[PDB]
Amino acid sequence: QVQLVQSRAEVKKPGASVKVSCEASGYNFVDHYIHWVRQAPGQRPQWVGWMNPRGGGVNYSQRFQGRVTMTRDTSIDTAYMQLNRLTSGDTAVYYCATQVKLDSSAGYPFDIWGQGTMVTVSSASTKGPSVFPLAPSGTAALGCLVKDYFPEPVTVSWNSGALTSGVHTFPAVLQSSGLYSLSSVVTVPSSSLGTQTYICNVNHKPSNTKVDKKVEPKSC
Amino acid sequence: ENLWVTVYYGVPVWKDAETTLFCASDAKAYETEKHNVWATHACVPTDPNPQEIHLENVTEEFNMWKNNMVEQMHTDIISLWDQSLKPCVKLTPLCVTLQCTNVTNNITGELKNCSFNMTTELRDKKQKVYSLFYRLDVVQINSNKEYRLINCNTSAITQACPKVSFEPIPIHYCAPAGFAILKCKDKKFNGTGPCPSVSTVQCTHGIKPVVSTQLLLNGSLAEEEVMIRSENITNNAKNILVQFNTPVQINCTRPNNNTRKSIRIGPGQAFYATGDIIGDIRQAHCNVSKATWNETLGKVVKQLRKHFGNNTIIRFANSSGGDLEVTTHSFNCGGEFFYCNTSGLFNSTWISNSNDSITLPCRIKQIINMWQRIGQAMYAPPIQGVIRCVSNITGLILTRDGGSTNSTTETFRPGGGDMRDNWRSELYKYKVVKIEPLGVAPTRCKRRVVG
Amino acid sequence: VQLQESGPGLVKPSETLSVTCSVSGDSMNNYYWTWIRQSPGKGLEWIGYISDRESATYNPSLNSRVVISRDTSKNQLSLKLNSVTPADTAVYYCATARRGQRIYGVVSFGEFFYYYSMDVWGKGTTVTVSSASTKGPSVFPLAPSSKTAALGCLVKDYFPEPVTVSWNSGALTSGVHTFPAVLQSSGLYSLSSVVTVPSSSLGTQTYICNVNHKPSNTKVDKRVEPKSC
Amino acid sequence: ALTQPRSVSGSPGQSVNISCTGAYSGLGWYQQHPGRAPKLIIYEVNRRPSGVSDRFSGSKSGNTASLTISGLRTEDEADYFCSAFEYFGEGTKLTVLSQPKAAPSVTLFPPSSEELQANKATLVCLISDFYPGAVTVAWKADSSPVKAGVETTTPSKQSNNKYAASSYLSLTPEQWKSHKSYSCQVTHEGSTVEKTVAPTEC
Amino acid sequence: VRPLSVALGETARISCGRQALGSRAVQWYQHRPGQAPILLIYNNQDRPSGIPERFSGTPDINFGTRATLTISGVEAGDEADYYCHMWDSRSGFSWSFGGATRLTVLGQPKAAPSVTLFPPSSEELQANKATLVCLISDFYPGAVTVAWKADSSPVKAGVETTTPSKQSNNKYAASSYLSLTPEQWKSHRSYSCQVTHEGSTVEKTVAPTEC
Amino acid sequence: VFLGFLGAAGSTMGAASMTLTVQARNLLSGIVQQQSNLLRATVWGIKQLQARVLAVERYLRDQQLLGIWGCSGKLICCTNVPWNSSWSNRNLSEIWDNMTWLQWDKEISNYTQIIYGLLEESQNQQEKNEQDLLALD
Ligand SMILES: *[C@@H]1O[C@H](CO)[C@@H](O[C@@H]2O[C@H](CO)[C@@H](O[C@@H]3O[C@H](CO[C@H]4O[C@H](CO)[C@@H](O)[C@H](O)[C@@H]4O[C@@H]4O[C@H](CO)[C@@H](O[C@@H]5O[C@H](CO)[C@H](O)[C@H](O)[C@H]5O)[C@H](O)[C@H]4NC(C)=O)[C@@H](O)[C@H](O[C@H]4O[C@H](CO)[C@@H](O)[C@H](O)[C@@H]4O)[C@@H]3O)[C@H](O)[C@H]2NC(C)=O)[C@H](O)[C@H]1NC(C)=O
Ligand SMILES: *[C@@H]1O[C@H](CO)[C@@H](O[C@@H]2O[C@H](CO)[C@@H](O[C@@H]3O[C@H](CO[C@H]4O[C@H](CO[C@H]5O[C@H](CO)[C@@H](O)[C@H](O)[C@@H]5O)[C@@H](O)[C@H](O[C@H]5O[C@H](CO)[C@@H](O)[C@H](O)[C@@H]5O)[C@@H]4O)[C@@H](O)[C@H](O[C@H]4O[C@H](CO)[C@@H](O)[C@H](O)[C@@H]4O)[C@@H]3O)[C@H](O)[C@H]2NC(C)=O)[C@H](O)[C@H]1NC(C)=O
Ligand SMILES: *[C@@H]1O[C@H](CO)[C@@H](O[C@@H]2O[C@H](CO)[C@@H](O[C@@H]3O[C@H](CO[C@H]4O[C@H](CO)[C@@H](O[C@@H]5O[C@H](CO)[C@@H](O)[C@H](O)[C@@H]5O)[C@H](O)[C@@H]4O)[C@@H](O)[C@H](O[C@H]4O[C@H](CO)[C@@H](O)[C@H](O)[C@@H]4O)[C@@H]3O)[C@H](O)[C@H]2NC(C)=O)[C@H](O)[C@H]1NC(C)=O
Ligand SMILES: *[C@@H]1O[C@H](CO)[C@@H](O[C@@H]2O[C@H](CO)[C@@H](O[C@@H]3O[C@H](CO[C@H]4O[C@H](CO[C@H]5O[C@H](CO[C@H]6O[C@H](CO)[C@@H](O)[C@H](O)[C@@H]6O)[C@@H](O)[C@H](O)[C@@H]5O)[C@@H](O)[C@H](O)[C@@H]4O)[C@@H](O)[C@H](O)[C@@H]3O)[C@H](O)[C@H]2NC(C)=O)[C@H](O)[C@H]1NC(C)=O
Ligand SMILES: *[C@@H]1O[C@H](CO)[C@@H](O[C@@H]2O[C@H](CO)[C@@H](O[C@@H]3O[C@H](CO[C@H]4O[C@H](CO)[C@@H](O)[C@H](O)[C@@H]4O)[C@@H](O)[C@H](O[C@H]4O[C@H](CO)[C@@H](O)[C@H](O)[C@@H]4O)[C@@H]3O)[C@H](O)[C@H]2NC(C)=O)[C@H](O)[C@H]1NC(C)=O
Ligand SMILES: *[C@@H]1O[C@H](CO[C@@H]2O[C@@H](C)[C@@H](O)[C@@H](O)[C@@H]2O)[C@@H](O[C@@H]2O[C@H](CO)[C@@H](O[C@@H]3O[C@H](CO)[C@@H](O)[C@H](O)[C@@H]3O)[C@H](O)[C@H]2NC(C)=O)[C@H](O)[C@H]1NC(C)=O
Ligand SMILES: *[C@@H]1O[C@H](CO)[C@@H](O[C@@H]2O[C@H](CO)[C@@H](O[C@@H]3O[C@H](CO)[C@@H](O)[C@H](O)[C@@H]3O)[C@H](O)[C@H]2NC(C)=O)[C@H](O)[C@H]1NC(C)=O
Ligand SMILES: *[C@@H]1O[C@H](CO)[C@@H](O[C@@H]2O[C@H](CO)[C@@H](O[C@@H]3O[C@H](CO)[C@@H](O)[C@H](O)[C@@H]3O)[C@H](O)[C@H]2NC(C)=O)[C@H](O)[C@H]1NC(C)=O
Ligand SMILES: *[C@@H]1O[C@H](CO)[C@@H](O[C@@H]2O[C@H](CO)[C@@H](O)[C@H](O)[C@H]2NC(C)=O)[C@H](O)[C@H]1NC(C)=O
Ligand SMILES: *[C@@H]1O[C@H](CO[C@@H]2O[C@@H](C)[C@@H](O)[C@@H](O)[C@@H]2O)[C@@H](O)[C@H](O)[C@H]1NC(C)=O
Ligand SMILES: *[C@@H]1O[C@H](CO)[C@@H](O)[C@H](O)[C@H]1NC(C)=O
Ligand SMILES: *[C@@H]1O[C@H](CO)[C@@H](O)[C@H](O)[C@H]1NC(C)=O
């Protein structure tokens, strides 16, 4: 009881529209307003609107009027919102909420919250990962760099699954173009440089992609 | 030096109470028909002269948004509709597949000539009839084409008996003994708070229950400056209620000379279909003098900057949401239900430093689900002849926009989804209290000793 | 502002009928323009119009067979009708139209309609649709009694109507009386023209009948002379 | 214009001092844990919502609100926010120091040979085993500021609850063979290290 | 078509063939067969320059008022076809001119026909064909009987006869043709043409031997 | 001059205690204002009836208190319950002059029940019994 649930996360591209549901239950949906808020992973939350079911009426933050459209389906105790003219600049986490169990009839602020719907807007057209090693030279470090692949995740390994210790991998930065990019590193004894061989592998299902990289031992 | 408590009966002490209030209407009995929806058979006749009694030195708090009287009239009006709808013709059989075609080929078509089978008086016999239906009441289903009424998938429907009238007449409200109604006589009355000038009345003023949207009609006005009353002005979620100081004029017409078709659909039951239009087919509209409307907006932005800064950009825009009944100045006029595009009004920009009357296109429905109510829908029967009713605009209901670029400029569009908001427009000046005639105070008076 | 139509007078079925109207007394741009026909034994039929702005509208009853244009150079309006049938035999009239707007409601919404009044009319042009070939007429003199007297010319066995006849090339106008043509059993036409003249001009004044049959382009000049007695 | 502090130092059993200045500010106070579902802590400015802990209360002014906490925990490590009707303050990441400080283990990598052959040269600097979750990356080829080709991540939670980050200086096979040795300077808690790479190895 | 008859001098009143629904705009046209049409009244009541004030149309003053043409002082010359071009706001574009009211004016002076009969021309007999030509003018009414005789016996071979038609003077004219052979022409003593009109007969005669 | 009903509700307490007949009149009627009205013969009926019951129900509870306090016939009666001064410390001048029954009833909103218990226990439970043993002679 008294809870919000939202539609599934989506990824849409520029221009396109997007409709997100927010199914509400545990309280008589009709009486209370319903506002919608947007958080970017990395800026504040930006209020957008509100819509009483009793009348279905709205008003939208001027940064947002026109592009947005909020709709209800009281037959089912549910609201919606549709955002058109999608640009990459509007990718963010979108939460629905209302004030019900307070004692403040002034409509504000909001306490009851949908978990949220994450919406990624990016022209994440299909682009192929290019994998490049990182050479060695006490101890010596060697790694591999996976670059320029359309949506995550990739999977990287070493020595056909027989070399697992001393390694550390770092999170993929969405490169500003719409290409993810990550890399790996393993620390080996410099006494095995020139004799022992060390190899890296990479995987990416979205395009049925598979890249390897041989690294013969440099004498160092 | 001997202090004794002493009892006083009939002392001027009262307390705030929520109680069962009563109706009041002029004892005008113009029956000479069978109409009258609001005053009914026996709403109690009004006092010839009301005894509005001023109370010296007395200062009382009013709060129209936490008022129990509004949240009472609203429910008071509701029960009367159902009570007037119950004995009337239920249109369960009008949900047949409707075969409808467009009227006009001199297109310069929002209305349909609709043929359908129906039930006759004999249970076994069926009839093919035609009726005219406005576009809003009907929907298409899949060659012909085939159609249905909009309500058939939401609720059942019942037709208002033709005898009943939808005209709001002023209705007062009187309190039982032991209770009292307090009436604020403050012209500059803020939305809420203490009213320095208070009179007491047995009954409220004639409140015309005009059910209307985006604009209050045939109401009570405001003295001096136009009045802005909100529960919280700075809060968008709480509406902003506006009361005018000068009434403007509105002429509303449905310009087609319509006709009523009595179709018998059973023993006693009789459906009133829309017959062929006679004369031109013209769309409903309302004019308001454009000059007067520019005047009225000035008094508004003047009372507005007293709450928004001497300088800020205050513009007006049209409604941007809601049902069809909230997007339009919805109202009833003469028995047909009008829904009017208000964009020509809320179109200007204000910088806070002939008539040429604006015309509003109006659509019309006969199937209505009023009071944001799902369930019993109503068929308003067609009104024979042309319609023209004159209404004053005695108020407005507005609403502001959420967070913009530092509030650079502030924007106002209409809408009033709750109906009580219309009642607050006539009830801000009243409040309910209960009488406490028992007071205790210390005096030197002692009763004669028993011993 | 005066208009005179001209056409082929006869086209065979499935061919194209072309009629034009020459304008005198005024230009073409200040009026809406229109064509109408009258078939023998049936009433008037409205064909279509072309406005000031060269925008043309045609009656849908005609199955898209019509082209109207304003050849503004010759001050001519043109009409061509393809896929003709014998059912198209009629008199074709050109006319100007004055456009009216009758307001019965609000202009901003559009509660008005346009209508047309035809204020200046042409003379008409007769066209027969038949596969039969034209035949130029034979003209014979009808001599006056020798004993006032009436004389004329007989225009025999022609096809189709009409024929123009003048007397002394237009110079003899008082007392001329031409008759409606007879349709013979052979399906050929004949008509007659008579002029009543003073008995005392005979033998000295030459009376020559000028016959113009545009469809077969037969123009015959026929002397009518007095009886030898 | 609605504003509040950005970061606040803290530790268990302590108290944290935060602010928010603005008209009608401190209408409510929220807590977003990394991920989803922000949650109201106190409505108005001093209203224990029915159903929260008692050690929560808030003060304010004519334009400046202030949220107050006693007996800090690691359970209150999240981002905290100031509500103003329509407008929402910037955002304070409250840190509750439960781990000791850790200096970054920095390893800078030059571009590989099969990366130089496809018309590419990416410098790979990996920043690991630091706490709290923060490292500043400053790329300077020959100590001159390079403001071209810089990709930075955000601090990610390792297995050891220390934090990791990585940075990418996108260079060309022509840019990789121009300067003497590209020096990536990782600032940690003020301290700055200098790890350098060149096309001639160790 | 719809026929109507009126006596000279009376006021004729013509109803539209089609009835108006709603707001109307009516133009009236007069056509006598063989002429271009003339606009009599437009926009219901308005009369173009050149039209007598004897003619009036019905103004559209609120609805119900059937469109009517009023003709004061009916003349012989008003015998014509009348068209009501009905335009209204509900019927769409009015492509149809409506039915014609064919106006007959009765009461015109009877006028006996003037008749002239011509024998074959000297040029035609040379071409071996003989046709008799009978021309009839100035009569009213139009009912007329045309018969041919050879000597004094009826003939029905080769006889071709026209429909009577109005002259500019509003009386009627007609003609009759008898197609023969020269052998018929010279072998007979004479031929006669007989024109019967309102109970009276005009008869002329020709002969191969006459001057 | 006679002006109406409750005019002195905001005046000082001494002045208001004088016009108790006027307030006594309007507590029940009621039937001058609304018998039914059964002169002509729904929702208004229910409201009316609920209003009439609420009026006599409130009125009879107040007259009930005066009966067991021996004040049935009177508009003003004095008692034996001493004013324990802790109830209000204002002297006989601050209470009755430059204060309304309202600001007094607000100040006295407490101890009202204690006084009621003292009013029902202290006198009328003893006074009526002493009257029976007294009239025996
Ligand atoms: C619409 O909705 C919004 C919010 O949703 C409403 O905004 C809020 O309304 C509240 C009323 O419901 C109001 O609450 C009052 O707060 C005052 C604050 O005063 C002091 O309170 C604290 C003590 O408990 C102090 O700690 C504070 O620091 C504060 O100090 C002073 O506050 C002044 C307020 O602006 C500030 O500026 C002064 O403003 C005045 C007015 O304009 C003059 O200019 C003056 O010259 C200015 O200096 C001072 O700088 C500041 N001073 C210092 C040293 O900090 C509170 O006092 C009050 O409490 C009343 O009752 C108590 C007893 O219970 C009594 O002791 C008090 O004296 C007082 O009488 C209220 O609780 C909120 O402040 C306000 N804002 C916020 C953010 O919540 C709108 O009002 C709603 N609109 C409508 C139409 O309803
Ligand atoms: C909207 O459209 C309506 C429909 O047209 C229109 O109302 C009509 O307006 C016309 C205008 O011409 C009125 O016509 C007048 O009729 C007078 C006599 O009224 C009798 O006749 C009515 C119709 O007559 C026809 O039908 C009957 C039935 O078969 C037949 O006998 C007749 O011969 C004729 O063909 C008839 O309907 C009417 O009955 C009414 O009352 C009964 C009461 O129970 C009710 O049952 C009916 O339904 C109806 O309501 C009655 O029997 C006639 O005398 C008059 O001429 C004089 O009138 C005035 C008198 O004041 C004089 O000033 C004037 O100069 C003439 O001397 C005229 O012909 C017609 O009556 C109206 N409609 C009805 C139903 O009555 C509206 O005006 C339109 N509104 C707009 C456009 O805004
Ligand atoms: C919505 O749709 C409805 C559809 O019903 C529209 O209403 C309809 O409107 C039409 C048009 O006016 C109307 O038809 C007229 O009918 C008249 C009667 O003639 C017909 O009907 C008779 C029966 O009434 C038939 O039987 C004959 O009756 C004779 C006695 O009158 C009898 O002697 C004979 O032996 C027969 O038994 C008859 O055969 C014929 O079908 C007509 O006078 C009228 O005239 C005009 O239209 C027609 C169509 O071309 C022409 O032929 C005619 O010469 C003239 O120009 C109409 O035909 C129909 O009854 C009516 N229907 C209803 C149910 O009222 C309505 O307009 C639409 N619009 C709106 C807004 O609702
Ligand atoms: C709310 O407000 C609206 C808006 O005002 C009101 O709407 C009016 O409603 C009324 C009643 O229903 C309507 O009244 C009708 O109006 C028409 C027209 O009247 C006007 O025009 C005539 C025209 O005469 C002059 O102009 C002509 C133009 O000539 C040329 O026209 C054509 C242009 O293309 C062309 O094709 C022609 O061939 C021609 O060359 C001249 O020829 C003529 O000689 C004049 O100079 C005037 O006579 C009038 O005075 C008036 O100006 C009338 O025909 C009807 O009788 C009727 O009166 C009115 O039209 C609506 N207004 C508008 C703007 O349309 C509502 O009524 C209001 N409602 C409420 C409840 O208040
Ligand atoms: C309720 O009212 C509705 C109309 O609003 C009526 O619905 C119609 O139902 C009938 C069924 O009786 C449909 O009628 C037609 O059925 C025909 C079958 O043949 C009939 O005619 C022959 C003639 O020799 C008889 O032998 C035979 O027994 C049948 O009587 C089809 O031929 C029809 O198709 C024709 O019409 C449609 C459009 O209507 C065209 O698309 C076709 O090309 C063809 O021209 C049709 O199927 C009829 O379709 C229904 N009406 C409509 C508008 O669709 C009900 O009868 C009435 N009463 C009820 C429901 O009780
Ligand atoms: C309350 O309002 C009263 C006036 O209202 C009247 O009196 C109340 C007691 C109520 O019963 C009301 O219903 C009633 O209408 C104010 O009272 C005024 O007080 C002044 C003293 O400050 C009086 O002045 C005196 O008048 C006499 C008569 O000539 C002189 O001899 C005196 O020397 C002195 O001038 C005044 O008459 C009196 N009345 C009016 C109408 O003002 C009162 O101030 C106010 N507030 C309270 C009682 O707290
Ligand atoms: C008779 O009425 C029907 C509706 O019941 C008409 O059908 C409508 O056809 C139009 C044109 O294809 C559809 O498009 C619409 O055009 C308008 C005008 O620009 C525009 O404002 C709309 O937004 C829409 O794009 C329209 O969708 C369709 N009606 C419905 C309900 O879908 C029909 O044209 C009418 N006339 C006949 C049948 O002669
Ligand atoms: C608000 O005020 C206007 C102004 O009066 C109201 O218009 C009134 O509407 C009623 C109902 O149509 C009219 O009363 C009736 O008129 C008919 C004839 O139309 C008559 O036969 C009846 O006896 C009855 O009097 C009234 O004329 C009309 N007022 C004016 C000035 O025309 C309007 O209805 C009011 N209410 C609402 C909800 O708008
Ligand atoms: C609505 O507006 C009309 C304007 O016509 C008001 O009617 C006027 O009322 C005043 C005072 O009652 C009179 O002095 C005028 O003479 C009235 N105007 C007339 C008769 O044309 C009316 O008061 C307004 N209010 C309501 C509730 O109807
Ligand atoms: C006067 O009354 C004061 C208020 O206390 C009240 O009376 C006592 C008997 C209890 O019932 C208590 O709960 C009430 O709130 C006393 O504090 C005071 O001592 C009393 N003094 C005298 C002299 O009666
Ligand atoms: C309403 O009350 C508030 C509270 O002081 C005040 O700021 C505002 O100006 C008041 N408005 C009016 C019209 O009294
Ligand atoms: C706003 O204007 C009003 C009225 O003209 C005036 O009383 C006031 O001083 C002005 N205030 C400011 C801040 O401009």
Numbering used by the authors:
A (entry chain D): 1 to 137, 144 to 226
B (entry chain G): 32 to 139, 152 to 185, 187 to 309, 312 to 321, 321A, 322 to 398, 410 to 507
C (entry chain H): 2 to 148, 154 to 235
D (entry chain E): 3 to 204
E (entry chain L): 8 to 218
F (entry chain B): 518 to 558, 569 to 664
Pull text from the paper:
In the past decade, it was discovered that a subset of HIV-1–infected individuals produce potent and broadly neutralizing antibodies (bNAbs) that target the HIV-1 envelope protein (Env) (1–4), a trimeric spike of gp120-gp41 heterodimers on the viral surface.
Because we observed no difference in the neutralization profile of BG24 S60AHC compared to wild type, we used the S60AHC construct to define the Env binding mechanism of BG24 to eliminate potential interference of a glycosylated N58HC residue in structural studies. We determined a 2.0-Å crystal structure of the BG24 S60AHC Fab and a 3.8-Å crystal structure of the BG24 S60AHC Fab in complex with a natively glycosylated clade A BG505 SOSIP.664 trimer and a Fab from the V3-glycan targeting bNAb 10-1074. In the heavy chain, BG24 lacks the canonical Trp residue at the −5 position in its CDRH3, which is highly conserved in most VRC01-class antibodies and forms H-bond interactions with residue N279gp120 at that antibody-antigen interface. BG24 features a Tyr at this position, which preserves D-loop interactions at the interface by forming an H-bond with a side-chain oxygen atom on N280gp120. Somatic mutations in FWR1 and CDRH1 mediated interprotomer gp120 contacts, while mutations in CDRL1 (including a 6–amino acid deletion) were necessary for accommodating the N276gp120-glycan at the CD4bs, consistent with other VRC01-class bNAbs.
